Amino acid sequence: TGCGELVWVGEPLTLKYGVWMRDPKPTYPYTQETTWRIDTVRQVFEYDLISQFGYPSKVHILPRPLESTGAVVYSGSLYFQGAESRTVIRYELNTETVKAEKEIPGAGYHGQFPYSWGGYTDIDLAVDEAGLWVIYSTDEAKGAIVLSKLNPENLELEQTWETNIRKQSVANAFIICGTLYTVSSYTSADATVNFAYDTGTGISKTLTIPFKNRYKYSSMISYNPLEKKLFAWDNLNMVTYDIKLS
Ligand code: NA
């Protein structure tokens, strides 16, 4: 099958070191060999070719800085969180136009609901086989992970789920085939995928899938559904994790 439940994660493989991003729904005039780099934060460097990816073909200046590296490129736009805000911005790359701005309702930001190793990781953007998502929490949710499916055109919240896991108790989270998975570790860098919440059914469960992790750091993890792989940035290297689905 093409989608399924996660059953295995591979070892992280190391791939201007980052943060690199690719579009899982490449849209002309961009292609699959188009790459974007966020400098680690207001400039986005664009590389048309993988060959040129070693000088940029274009440099974009964003209307405001990024809060964190938890941005995504999707269907020709950069989606990111504005610094010191709970606002998600859609920046169309080819036209250099802000096409949508949205306050995530009630979302904590700037150190209210970080992941377990901290940083400004309150709000994360994600892409899976069904499109664009945002992962966050609210005071009403008492720090539980909330996830919302976003309309990529106008950033309306098409559907929201309040899950039964505490955001500050997990090191990271990512969405694959409509299921939210969390990564948890008590005191070791190494960890486990310890929880799954299936947005198709509302059913959640505790898991024990090994998840190898190099640092006690709130990494940027970005699932790429086009490649069916996880990409991650640990402040030093871009890495990729292979996955297996049932
Ligand atoms: Na992420």
> What is the Å distance from ligand 1's center to 175 Cα?
8
Residues 6+ apart with CB under 8 A from 25: 74, 75, 76, 226
Q: Which of 164, 147, 71 is nearest to 107 (CA)?
A: 147
CA distances in angstroms from 148 to 76, 118, 135, 156, 203, listed in the order given: 21, 22, 7, 9, 16
Answer yes or no: are the C-beta atoms of 86 and 109 closer than 8 Å.
yes
Whether the Cβ atoms of residue 184 and residue 192 lie closer than 8 Å to each other: yes
Give residue 45 CA to ligand 1 midpoint distance, Å: 20
Kindly give the distance from the C-alpha atom of residue 30 to the centroid of ligand 1, in angstroms, as a whole number. 23
Cβ neighbours for 30, distance < 8 A, ≥ 6 positions apart: 23, 48, 76, 93, 94
Tokens standing for 245?
């689905």
Sort residue 143 into left (φ over 0), alpha (ψ -120 to 50) or beta.
left
Give me ligand 1 centre to Cα 4, in Å. Answer: 19
Residue 9 C-alpha to ligand 1 middle, in angstroms? 16
Contact predicate 88/79, CB 8 Å: yes
For ligand 1, a single-atom ion, the residues with CB < 5 A are 124, 221
Find the 70 Cα to ligand 1 centroid distance in Å. Answer: 6
Q: Resolution of this PDB entry, in A?
A: 1.8
Ligand 1: centre distance to CA 228 (Å): 15
At position 226, the amino acid (one-letter code) is L
What DSSP line would sit under 22-53, residue for residue?
A: --SS--TT--TT-EEEE----EEEEESSTTT-
Tokens of 2: 């093409």
Q: What angle do CA 123, 110, 166 make, to 5 degrees?
A: 55
Q: How far is the CA of 86 from the centre of ligand 1 (A)?
A: 16
- Please report, for residues 15, 90, 174, 208, the alpha-carbon distance to residue 182 in angstroms, rounded to integers and kept in the order given: 23, 26, 7, 11
How many domains does the chain divide into? 1
Way it was determined = X-ray
Ligand 1 centroid from CA 97, angstroms: 24
Give the distance (Å) from ligand 1 centre to CA of residue 128.
11
Amino acid (one-letter) located at 148:
S
Residues 137-141: contacts with CB under 8 Å, at least 24 apart: 137/107, 137/108, 137/112, 137/113, 137/167, 138/105, 138/106, 138/107, 138/108, 139/106, 139/108, 140/106, 141/106
Q: Residue 222: which H helix or E strand, with range? A: strand 220-224
**Cα of 122 from ligand 1 centre, angstroms:** 11
**For residue 181, what are the domain limits?**
1-246
Could you tell me if 204 and 193 are in contact, meaning their C-beta atoms sit under 8 angstroms apart? no
